[PDB]
Every structure is written in C-alpha cells, then in structure tokens.
C-alpha cells in the first residue's frame, strides 16, 4: 500500500565531494532522502517531476539528476511536514549526483527513476 518503487542506500556526492551515505526513497514523481534507514532524519525530497536524468561515466556507476532549466529540484516540505532538512554535507540546489554499489543495482534505480518522474 506503501506505494515505495524503491529503497536502498545510495552514495549522494555533496557540493564537498564528501560522498554520504543516506537512505533512499521512492515513490512517483519523489525521491524521499534520509539518514538512517528506518524512521529516519529526511534530509530532502527531490521533486522527480521538474527533473531529468543523465548517466555519468566512469568510477562504481553514478547518475546524475538535474533540471534542465537550473532551477530548484528540491521540496520546500517535508514528508511528514517538517519545515527544515537534516543538517548534511552541502548539497547542490538544481542537481543531484548519485552513485550506486553495482552497475546493476545504478541501472535499476535509473530505469525506475525514469518511469518516477512523469507520475504522481
């Protein structure tokens, strides 16, 4: 009933290449960012809707989520109504740099990231 595609961690690249690792979230037209992975500290909510996706070669496999137009990809609120993001490495305002453990694993999430962003 969840309505959750997909939820695993994935490594996000922050503005400071310090390369976090949080727990990752999806659902149509959201991906839900999180700390830990149950119950967890949300860091951000990228709006799918306002995106698109490119692969980014070569190390395992990164993806990179952007919007065309340079503008915010981000939800001004939380899931649960929370006003501010969890305190985390910096992180871009239009793009999201994302790595995953295994090229299987990076293309799965990119397949279903594809299909995420056109719904909800």
């Not at 979230?25 to 909510?45: A, F």
């Not at 709006?47 to 137009?69: D, M, Q, T, V, Y």
């Not at 990809?73 to 740099?97: C, D, F, R």
Request: glycine share 10%; with cysteine; charged share 20%.
């Amino acid at each position: 009933s969840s309505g959750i595609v997909m939820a695993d961690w994935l490594k996000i690249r922050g503005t400071l290449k310090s390369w976090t690792k949080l727990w990752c979230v999806l659902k149509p037209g959201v991906l839900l960012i999180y700390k830990t992975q149950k119950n967890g500290q949300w860091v951000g909510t990228v709006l799918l809707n306002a995106c698109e996706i490119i692969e980014r070669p070569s190390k395992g496999f990164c993806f990179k989520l952007f919007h065309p137009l340079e503008q915010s990809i981000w939800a001004v609120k939380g899931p649960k109504g929370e006003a501010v993001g969890s305190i985390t490495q910096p992180l871009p305002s239009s793009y999201l740099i994302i790595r995953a453990t295994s090229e299987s694993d990076g293309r799965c999430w990119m397949d279903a990231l594809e299909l995420a962003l056109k719904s909800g």
